Scaffold this active site. Structure first.
Site, PDB file in Angstrom:
ATOM      1  N   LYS A   1      -1.674  10.676 -12.593  1.00 48.21           N
ATOM      2  CA  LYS A   1      -1.805  12.120 -12.462  1.00 48.21           C
ATOM      3  C   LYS A   1      -1.356  12.831 -13.740  1.00 48.21           C
ATOM      4  O   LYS A   1      -1.921  13.856 -14.128  1.00 48.21           O
ATOM      5  CB  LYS A   1      -0.977  12.619 -11.279  1.00 48.21           C
ATOM      6  CG  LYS A   1      -1.495  12.172  -9.917  1.00 48.21           C
ATOM      7  CD  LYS A   1      -0.469  12.466  -8.830  1.00 48.21           C
ATOM      8  CE  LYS A   1      -0.604  11.499  -7.667  1.00 48.21           C
ATOM      9  NZ  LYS A   1       0.491  11.871  -6.800  1.00 48.21           N
TER      10      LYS A   1
ATOM     11  N   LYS B   1      12.876   2.391  -9.142  1.00 42.67           N
ATOM     12  CA  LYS B   1      12.175   3.375  -9.973  1.00 42.67           C
ATOM     13  C   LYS B   1      13.092   3.750 -11.128  1.00 42.67           C
ATOM     14  O   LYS B   1      12.661   4.341 -12.120  1.00 42.67           O
ATOM     15  CB  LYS B   1      11.825   4.629  -9.172  1.00 42.67           C
ATOM     16  CG  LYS B   1      11.181   4.354  -7.838  1.00 42.67           C
ATOM     17  CD  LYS B   1       9.716   4.667  -7.870  1.00 42.67           C
ATOM     18  CE  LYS B   1       9.244   5.168  -6.520  1.00 42.67           C
ATOM     19  NZ  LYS B   1       7.787   4.935  -6.397  1.00 42.67           N
TER      20      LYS B   1
ATOM     21  N   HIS C   1       1.130  -3.370  -0.887  1.00 43.10           N
ATOM     22  CA  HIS C   1       1.658  -2.324  -1.770  1.00 43.10           C
ATOM     23  C   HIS C   1       3.013  -2.590  -2.422  1.00 43.10           C
ATOM     24  O   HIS C   1       3.516  -1.739  -3.156  1.00 43.10           O
ATOM     25  CB  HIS C   1       1.757  -0.990  -1.018  1.00 43.10           C
ATOM     26  CG  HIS C   1       0.459  -0.500  -0.471  1.00 43.10           C
ATOM     27  ND1 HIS C   1      -0.369   0.358  -1.169  1.00 43.10           N
ATOM     28  CD2 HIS C   1      -0.168  -0.740   0.709  1.00 43.10           C
ATOM     29  CE1 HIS C   1      -1.440   0.621  -0.444  1.00 43.10           C
ATOM     30  NE2 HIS C   1      -1.344  -0.031   0.699  1.00 43.10           N
TER      31      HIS C   1
ATOM     32  N   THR D   1       0.929   5.965  -8.940  1.00 46.69           N
ATOM     33  CA  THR D   1      -0.265   6.812  -9.037  1.00 46.69           C
ATOM     34  C   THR D   1       0.095   8.137  -9.700  1.00 46.69           C
ATOM     35  O   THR D   1      -0.761   8.822 -10.277  1.00 46.69           O
ATOM     36  CB  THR D   1      -0.927   7.069  -7.659  1.00 46.69           C
ATOM     37  OG1 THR D   1       0.066   7.451  -6.702  1.00 46.69           O
ATOM     38  CG2 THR D   1      -1.643   5.816  -7.177  1.00 46.69           C
TER      39      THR D   1
ATOM     40  N   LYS E   1       9.085  11.421  -8.075  1.00 52.69           N
ATOM     41  CA  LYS E   1       8.658  10.369  -7.162  1.00 52.69           C
ATOM     42  C   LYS E   1       9.822  10.138  -6.197  1.00 52.69           C
ATOM     43  O   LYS E   1      10.922  10.639  -6.418  1.00 52.69           O
ATOM     44  CB  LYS E   1       8.356   9.085  -7.940  1.00 52.69           C
ATOM     45  CG  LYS E   1       9.553   8.525  -8.707  1.00 52.69           C
ATOM     46  CD  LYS E   1       9.295   8.536 -10.209  1.00 52.69           C
ATOM     47  CE  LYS E   1       8.635   7.248 -10.680  1.00 52.69           C
ATOM     48  NZ  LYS E   1       7.186   7.408 -10.998  1.00 52.69           N
ATOM     49  N   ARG E   2       9.596   9.397  -5.124  1.00 53.87           N
ATOM     50  CA  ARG E   2      10.688   9.150  -4.188  1.00 53.87           C
ATOM     51  C   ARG E   2      11.834   8.438  -4.920  1.00 53.87           C
ATOM     52  O   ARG E   2      11.599   7.655  -5.842  1.00 53.87           O
ATOM     53  CB  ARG E   2      10.189   8.309  -3.007  1.00 53.87           C
ATOM     54  CG  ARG E   2       9.243   9.058  -2.070  1.00 53.87           C
ATOM     55  CD  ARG E   2       9.993  10.080  -1.220  1.00 53.87           C
ATOM     56  NE  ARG E   2      10.927   9.452  -0.285  1.00 53.87           N
ATOM     57  CZ  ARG E   2      10.683   9.256   1.009  1.00 53.87           C
ATOM     58  NH1 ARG E   2       9.531   9.641   1.534  1.00 53.87           N
ATOM     59  NH2 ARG E   2      11.590   8.676   1.780  1.00 53.87           N
TER      60      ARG E   2
HETATM   61  O1  LIG Z   1       4.488   4.335  -1.017  1.00 54.91           O
HETATM   62  C1  LIG Z   1       4.552   3.132  -0.721  1.00 54.91           C
HETATM   63  N1  LIG Z   1       5.118   2.728   0.460  1.00 54.91           N
HETATM   64  C2  LIG Z   1       5.654   3.543   1.433  1.00 54.91           C
HETATM   65  O2  LIG Z   1       5.694   4.777   1.344  1.00 54.91           O
HETATM   66  C3  LIG Z   1       6.236   2.933   2.692  1.00 54.91           C
HETATM   67  C4  LIG Z   1       6.068   3.610   3.942  1.00 54.91           C
HETATM   68  C5  LIG Z   1       6.599   3.058   5.141  1.00 54.91           C
HETATM   69  C6  LIG Z   1       7.297   1.821   5.104  1.00 54.91           C
HETATM   70  C7  LIG Z   1       7.470   1.137   3.866  1.00 54.91           C
HETATM   71  C8  LIG Z   1       6.939   1.690   2.671  1.00 54.91           C
HETATM   72  N2  LIG Z   1       4.043   2.223  -1.612  1.00 54.91           N
HETATM   73  C9  LIG Z   1       3.442   2.663  -2.863  1.00 54.91           C
HETATM   74  O3  LIG Z   1       1.995   2.712  -2.684  1.00 54.91           O
HETATM   75  C10 LIG Z   1       1.309   3.185  -3.863  1.00 54.91           C
HETATM   76  C11 LIG Z   1      -0.207   3.216  -3.534  1.00 54.91           C
HETATM   77  O4  LIG Z   1      -0.696   1.864  -3.440  1.00 54.91           O
HETATM   78  C12 LIG Z   1       1.627   2.298  -5.111  1.00 54.91           C
HETATM   79  O5  LIG Z   1       0.983   2.806  -6.291  1.00 54.91           O
HETATM   80  C13 LIG Z   1       3.156   2.280  -5.352  1.00 54.91           C
HETATM   81  O6  LIG Z   1       3.501   1.453  -6.476  1.00 54.91           O
HETATM   82  C14 LIG Z   1       3.839   1.727  -4.061  1.00 54.91           C
HETATM   83  O7  LIG Z   1       5.268   1.683  -4.200  1.00 54.91           O
HETATM   84  C1  LIG Z   2       1.328  10.923  -6.377  1.00 59.83           C
HETATM   85  C2  LIG Z   2       2.524  11.202  -5.395  1.00 59.83           C
HETATM   86  C3  LIG Z   2       3.486  10.197  -5.128  1.00 59.83           C
HETATM   87  C4  LIG Z   2       3.463   8.774  -5.814  1.00 59.83           C
HETATM   88  O1  LIG Z   2       4.202   8.720  -7.052  1.00 59.83           O
HETATM   89  P1  LIG Z   2       4.669   7.410  -7.808  1.00 59.83           P
HETATM   90  O2  LIG Z   2       5.150   7.863  -9.130  1.00 59.83           O
HETATM   91  O3  LIG Z   2       3.588   6.385  -7.728  1.00 59.83           O
HETATM   92  O4  LIG Z   2       5.941   6.899  -6.971  1.00 59.83           O
HETATM   93  C5  LIG Z   2       4.567  10.498  -4.365  1.00 59.83           C
HETATM   94  N1  LIG Z   2       4.716  11.751  -3.844  1.00 59.83           N
HETATM   95  C6  LIG Z   2       3.798  12.745  -4.071  1.00 59.83           C
HETATM   96  C7  LIG Z   2       4.077  14.131  -3.526  1.00 59.83           C
HETATM   97  C8  LIG Z   2       2.697  12.489  -4.853  1.00 59.83           C
HETATM   98  O5  LIG Z   2       1.814  13.509  -5.155  1.00 59.83           O
END
Ligand SMILES: O=C(NC(=O)c1ccccc1)N[C@@H]1O[C@H](CO)[C@@H](O)[C@H](O)[C@H]1O
Ligand SMILES: *Cc1c(COP(=O)(O)O)cnc(C)c1O
Ligand SMILES: O=C(NC(=O)c1ccccc1)N[C@@H]1O[C@H](CO)[C@@H](O)[C@H](O)[C@H]1O
Ligand SMILES: O=C(NC(=O)c1ccccc1)N[C@@H]1O[C@H](CO)[C@@H](O)[C@H](O)[C@H]1O
Ligand SMILES: O=C(NC(=O)c1ccccc1)N[C@@H]1O[C@H](CO)[C@@H](O)[C@H](O)[C@H]1O
Ligand SMILES: *Cc1c(COP(=O)(O)O)cnc(C)c1O
Lengths: 817, 817
Positions: A660, A554, A357, A656, A548-549
């Site tokens: 959305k 980002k 990921h 993702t 997003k986080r």
């Molecule tokens: O969210 C994470 N990772 C974590 O939350 C995480 C959790 C624990 C430790 C390290 C990372 N990765 C995310 O996973 C989504 C789904 O494949 C991708 O679309 C996105 O680009 C990626 O940053």
């Molecule tokens: C879809 C979703 C994410 C992932 O968002 P990205 O823009 O890919 O970082 C994170 N948090 C919540 C609550 C979501 O619904």
């Protein structure tokens, strides 16, 4: 009222009496003392009753048919609320809406009472949740396996513009969706030592912790299939956790039970940096050890030759978190089942598959050898043996390439020896995949180049997707209705049919409708913002949102620079017209991520200046969305006009949230990163707002050397912003409050924010120009929505199924309930 | 089948369908995978459904009628299982028996699956449970308030003849009887400091812990009344238990929540010595603080003049454990409600009543002042003020009696200052009672003489009792049936009617029946002993049993000496006839009580010698009953022939096990102690086996000086036993294993075991003589059972109600369900 299903006369009558039944016998209440929470519970129980029948037959069906089973191992499952989603997949929404109406209640008000099952950080966890839904909808015999944390992701509170973390006690009032299954508790071992005796190795003197499973139903979309998500809870044994006699105190002994149960206590909120804490390693082995025992036990029943194991079992690893599954499968096969190494390895590789990921180094799991040595001695021995044999394969393929040998090792030398879990996953899996085309290509070209050269057949791509049920029908019924009005309902489980909407791009009626639901969504959100957060925004402005986080990659910071620019331009020429904008930024920062928390403070600090400047008026509003989570996403996204997906090219594996927004009528402004590339490719670059460096440009800049000063010197607008930050313009009482951000931006910006500033601002101007032309903006929107079918997780799952698991998806309805 | 109620055709049909309903929708199972545990649960839920209706109306009734409410505060509620008791009070036993039969199940087998709610140590806790049942049966608006420990009294395991403690995880599979009520969580404060400002004192900077209540229904006997037992669970707040920022770790902060929740984690197993641990003080304030808030809130609704508080509220303190209720009521009234001291005190005294359960000094609660100072600063200030005013009253009544002043103080000087909780209870209660006539007299003559002289009107007696429903109808249906066959059923809620049985003492039929159920009971128990413990006993021998917690004062040791004597007499004259006996001793020892644990080892060590001596044959069997608890008592008692109640005269406040045996057809051999005096007085001394010193003889011995050597020197049989113990006769591998017991017996026996030896042995001979005459033994039994009516807790409760609470009991059925 909508194609939320039919509201039958008998169905509505039955629902009503069962609601009263639960309110009385289950809640032990009466209409005179019942609170809205009791009402929510009465309803949740009534709806839940409709799953039981299907749940039992689905599981019974898999027992008889004995299909290949798919096991999705993840330390995160970002589920959100399940009441409405259950009504949707069961076609009960309208019937329940009617029934509660007649009982004199507002269903929407009751739905708001449900707590979010926040057992995930963000994208990775939410992907597992979308996947579980699609797997059920495509009739696969799949099981989601994870940990049932009593505390999920923390609740974010903003205090003085600062993020405050508060425990997410989501189980406080109980979870009517889970079903505890103590009859299936399993023992997990920790520590101990290894004994080498005549016939094989033996792991002894281990500390035992019990794993108690809790089952949650996962209903497919209108096909009567109900799969299971099994979450493990840590429990201490009542003996030794009291039986290891010889003083200490009887009381103390039972109070110390909490040390073993701490394993499933809280979800780790770390998003960016890999800490390497012992409690986390324990959580990882715990979910792996318990799940495998359950998997093997179920296999032994089926219909002892483990030769057929890979033909009946598929284990998907969601990142490296559950990677111990590889050495754990070997331990069981070699140590307990007594299979020869080679035969055991063949089996393991054929059943395991790994999903990556991210490519950022700080996130990679590299466990200190001294930790594995103490906690899991036998696994360390198995990992060393795996490494030995693997490196022997490499040496044989690239004779004399001594450097490739050290680069590929699962064991990293240096300060402290570590085990590279990603290398472990590649060696022990028959498939390795990225989550977006560009990301999967980068894995082969860079990070895993040596492995790709060794076994090219292992690497694949499986572009992420989102579930159209929750992310369209559930959160945007209005939009779902007008679509269904024209092309039918078949698209909800076949999103590609959305393409048919292209033939309405010039439809005066459709254009008016699409534009109308978005305005209704914006008014509803604008109201919610005042109801629960009292702020007041103009629903006529452009809704600019980035949720997003919070991460440096980002680049929420790049967004902030644009916002300050807009404000500075207004202050320069106050009486000039500008498209009004309400820019909303929201997301949680990992507790120990200083920079991320500094960025949240900046955002609120900007809003304090901008939102109270009389000259700005209602032309510019900067709002920070508190406690961003799944249930909140279901509210903002349907109401957004502009979706911000501005990560540095090459850093966001896929994303993702971007999918959305596309599905809900927002236009996208982003870089050619992750899935953004495939979305623009699907809708046409003309219907997308692309800008900034591409992966190659970033590389070129790196060879040369990124010097932020250069941009500071050539762009006056940029220089002015940086000086405002340094002088305390946005922090009067604390003039140097943001020195860390400015310092980073100028001297150590790994994400080249400045390098994309100019193109980003210009691009933002083109967005404002199109918004000024309602008809054309909406027409572009129609072309985005009409081409988003590719991003449904049903497509993603169908590909995993076919190209990795070896199973055929089926849209066949199960024999009624 | 018995007067377990009618088994109606419609009733049985309805029960069956609801059992299948729960098995499916509640348990989510199907007849093909259901385990006996699932079946028990399906039934428990089906039975529980019948309480809901009554539970809601009973509470609704009290709201409308607004009667005086009785609040029973206890840190212990020894409930046992509740499935069968619920069927009994609801007259559902036969219907459920039939219904499960038709579903092809054995109800008795399912009943054995239920876990015992072991939230009590022994008599004090079990008295609260019998009281709750009688209060519901007499229609009083009463509430039982306590703590919901997740771990009750430890499960006793015998390892190598030694007691091993194991955690009692009774909630593991869930408790279908409780109903969590988070909507009523209350905050409890700890620590902090006191601030004296203009208008009154203020308790500030306190640490907050939440009290979440769990409600369990308490159904009266066939009157449709269902009272409530509310048990508090400790919960941490999600804020500060994470909000007290400034480093420490986010993870750690949430893991440390367990420090606050440890309060309701485990029941203290200490039976004899008062430890004075901080965790225990916390448990005591916790139940008191939460309960009072609940009591006052309910009062404020009723129908702010607290002048009527004592007319609407009665608070009974079960020992000094909940004594903080006194200073806590004052704190609330004076500090929060702003009532003047004197008015507040008048109110407090009028609503509080205290019950004493022992006179042994080591059990008395004397809390170090430094502990109260740190944990509850304001309460300490209130206690000092109470003491001041009280002592001012004493000085005024006995001018110049400087010594009486120090004896009566609530504050004890010396090594460390302590607060005498019993003195606190006497000063703040309008009533103080003993639990048996002799005990109440001893309180006035000795321990509380000074207080009795000051306010003679305060002291009363309320002889203990047991509930005839659980202790007769439930555990001995056979005996209950033959009684009902002659005098009807009215006696189950009017035990005095048992006197009518006196006119059948010469009835050849009745004699044969009484003797028959006892033989059936003995055969059933003898079987259970082999089924679950594999041992084998002769059901034709006399069942000699002493079951109760292990204490030196209960003198299980005096019993052991008799057993060794019997064995020594058999070995001397092997071919002489002796009445065969199976002597069973059972009970748990407090974990830190060394002597008590040494006594358990002696008992098993005696059995090892006796039970394997070929010359003894089946004439003598020594069995130690493992894990004695409520559900086990329900099994042994109905099967006993001889009940051992041999405490040193003056030490057992009352005893209740003794009343359980009398009601079930066993004859009693005991001393004139506690309730033994009133039982012999009710049945006639000729129908009792009394022996040993009376309270006066013990005193005379003390003035003189107790010298064990004297008895050792004059009784050869006794000397021989002591030498067997010292020489290692009963501990071959460890010859000196029992030196501590011998040492104590000879040099520091506070309970004069030797002094009662000779009379005890001779008395035991008279018991053996009567057993040799079946007809006469049974006739005596009939006279004991026929005169046990006085010992029903309905009588006890009716007296508390009338003489202490000021409420009239009512046997009126509530308006149907
Ligand atoms: O969210 C994470 N990772 C974590 O939350 C995480 C959790 C624990 C430790 C390290 C990372 N990765 C995310 O996973 C989504 C789904 O494949 C991708 O679309 C996105 O680009 C990626 O940053
Ligand atoms: C879809 C979703 C994410 C992932 O968002 P990205 O823009 O890919 O970082 C994170 N948090 C919540 C609550 C979501 O619904
Ligand atoms: O927790 C659940 N969950 C469900 O029944 C359920 C049913 C369908 C779908 C999801 C959850 N049930 C619970 O199971 C325990 C133990 O059997 C019962 O005592 C309790 O009353 C019941 O609600
Ligand atoms: O725990 C109980 N207990 C009882 O319902 C009950 C009823 C009558 C008598 C005793 C207990 N009920 C539980 O209440 C929770 C929260 O409302 C539900 O989610 C759960 O399914 C239900 O079994
Ligand atoms: O059982 C106790 N006491 C305790 O269990 C106890 C618990 C905690 C701390 C100290 C004592 N007392 C017992 O209470 C019963 C009922 O009144 C009497 O009949 C009996 O004689 C007495 O010893
Ligand atoms: C009745 C009872 C007691 C009290 O017995 P005494 O002989 O008064 O000490 C203790 N434990 C249990 C399990 C009981 O049923």
């Amino acid at each position: 009222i909508s194609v939320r299903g039919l509201a039958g006369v008998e169905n509505v009558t039955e629902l009503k009496k069962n609601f009263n039944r639960h309110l009385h016998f289950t809640l032990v209440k009466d209409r005179n003392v019942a609170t809205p929470r009791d009402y929510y519970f009465a309803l949740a129980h009534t709806v839940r009753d409709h799953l039981v029948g299907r749940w039992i037959r689905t599981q019974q069906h898999y027992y008889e048919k004995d299909p290949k089973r798919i096991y999705y191992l993840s330390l995160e499952f970002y589920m959100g609320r399940t009441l409405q989603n259950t009504m949707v997949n069961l076609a009960l929404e309208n019937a329940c809406d009617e029934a509660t109406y007649q009982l004199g209640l507002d269903m929407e008000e009751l739905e708001e009472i449900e707590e979010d099952a926040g057992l995930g950080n963000g994208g990775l966890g939410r992907l597992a949740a979308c996947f579980l839904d699609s797997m059920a909808t495509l009739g696969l015999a799949a099981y989601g396996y994870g940990i049932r944390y009593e505390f999920g992701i923390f609740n974010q509170k903003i205090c003085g513009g600062w993020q405050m973390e508060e425990a997410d006690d989501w189980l406080r009032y109980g979870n009517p969706w889970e079903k505890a299954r103590p009859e299936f508790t399993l023992p997990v071992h920790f520590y101990g030592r290894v004994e080498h005796t005549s016939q094989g190795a033996k792991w002894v003197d281990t500390q035992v912790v019990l794993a108690m499973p809790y089952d949650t139903p996962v209903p497919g979309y209108r096909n009567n299939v109900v799969n299971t998500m099994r979450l493990w809870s840590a429990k201490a044994p009542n003996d030794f956790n009291l039986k290891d006699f010889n003083v200490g105190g009887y009381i103390q002994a039972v109070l110390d039970r909490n040390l073993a149960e701490n394993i499933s206590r809280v979800l780790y909120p770390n998003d960016n940096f890999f800490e390497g804490k012992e409690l986390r390693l324990k959580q990882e082995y715990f979910v792996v050890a318990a799940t495998l025992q359950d998997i093997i036990r179920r296999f032994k029943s089926s219909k002892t030759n483990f030769d057929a194991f890979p033909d009946k079992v598929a284990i998907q690893l969601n990142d490296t978190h559950p990677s111990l599954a590889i050495p754990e499968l070997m331990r069981v096969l070699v140590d307990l089942e007594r299979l020869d190494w080679d035969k055991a390895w063949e089996v393991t590789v054929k059943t395991c598959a790994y999903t990556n990921h991210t490519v950022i180094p700080e996130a990679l799991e590299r466990w200190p050898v001294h930790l594995l040595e103490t906690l899991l001695p036998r696994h360390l021995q198995i990992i060393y043996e795996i490494n030995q044999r693997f490196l022997n394969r490499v040496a044989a393929a690239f004779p004399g390439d001594v450097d490739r040998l050290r680069r590929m090792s699962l064991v990293e030398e240096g300060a402290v020896k570590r085990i590279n879990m990603a290398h472990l996953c590649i060696a022990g899996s028959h498939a390795v995949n990225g989550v977006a085309r560009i990301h999967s290509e980068i894995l082969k070209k860079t990070i895993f180049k040596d492995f790709y050269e060794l076994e090219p057949h292992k690497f694949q791509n499986k572009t992420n997707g989102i579930t159209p049920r929750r992310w369209l029908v559930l959160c945007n019924p209005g939009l779902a209705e007008i679509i269904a009005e024209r092309i039918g309902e078949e698209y909800i489980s076949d999103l590609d049919q959305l393409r048919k909407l292209l033939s309405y791009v010039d439809d005066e009626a459709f254009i008016r409708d699409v534009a109308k639901v978005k305005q209704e969504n914006k008014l509803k959100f604008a109201a919610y913002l005042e109801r629960e957060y009292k702020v007041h925004i103009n629903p006529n402005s452009l809704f600019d949102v980035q949720v997003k986080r919070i991460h440096e990659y980002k680049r929420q910071l790049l967004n902030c620079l644009h916002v300050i620019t807009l404000y500075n331009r207004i202050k320069k020429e106050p009486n000039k017209f500008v498209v009004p904008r309400t820019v909303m930024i929201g997301g949680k920062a990992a507790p120990g991520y200083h920079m991320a928390k500094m960025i949240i403070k900046l955002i609120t600090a900007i809003g304090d200046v901008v939102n109270h400047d009389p000259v700005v008026g209602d032309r510019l509003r900067v709002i920070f969305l508190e406690n961003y989570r799944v249930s909140l996403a279901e509210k903002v996204i349907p109401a957004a006009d502009l979706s911000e997906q501005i990560s540095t090219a090459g850093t966001e594996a896929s994303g993702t949230g971007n999918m959305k927004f596309m599905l809900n009528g927002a236009l996208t402004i982003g870089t050619m990163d992750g899935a953004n590339v495939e979305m623009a490719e699907e809708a046409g670059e003309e219907n997308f707002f692309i800008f900034g460096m591409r992966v190659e440009d970033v590389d070129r800049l790196d060879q040369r050397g990124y010097n932020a000063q250069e941009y500071y010197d050539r762009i006056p607008e940029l220089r002015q912003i940086i000086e405002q930050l340094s002088s305390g313009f946005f922090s009067p009482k604390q003039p140097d409050l943001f020195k860390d951000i400015v310092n980073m931006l100028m001297h150590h910006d790994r994400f080249k924010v400045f390098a994309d500033y100019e193109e980003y601002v210009k691009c933002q101007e083109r967005v404002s120009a199109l918004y000024k032309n309602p008809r054309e903006w909406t027409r572009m929107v129609i072309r985005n929505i009409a081409t988003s079918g590719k991003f449904s997780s049903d497509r993603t799952i169908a590909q995993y199924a076919r190209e990795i698991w070896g199973v055929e998806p089926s849209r066949q309805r199960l024999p009624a309930p």
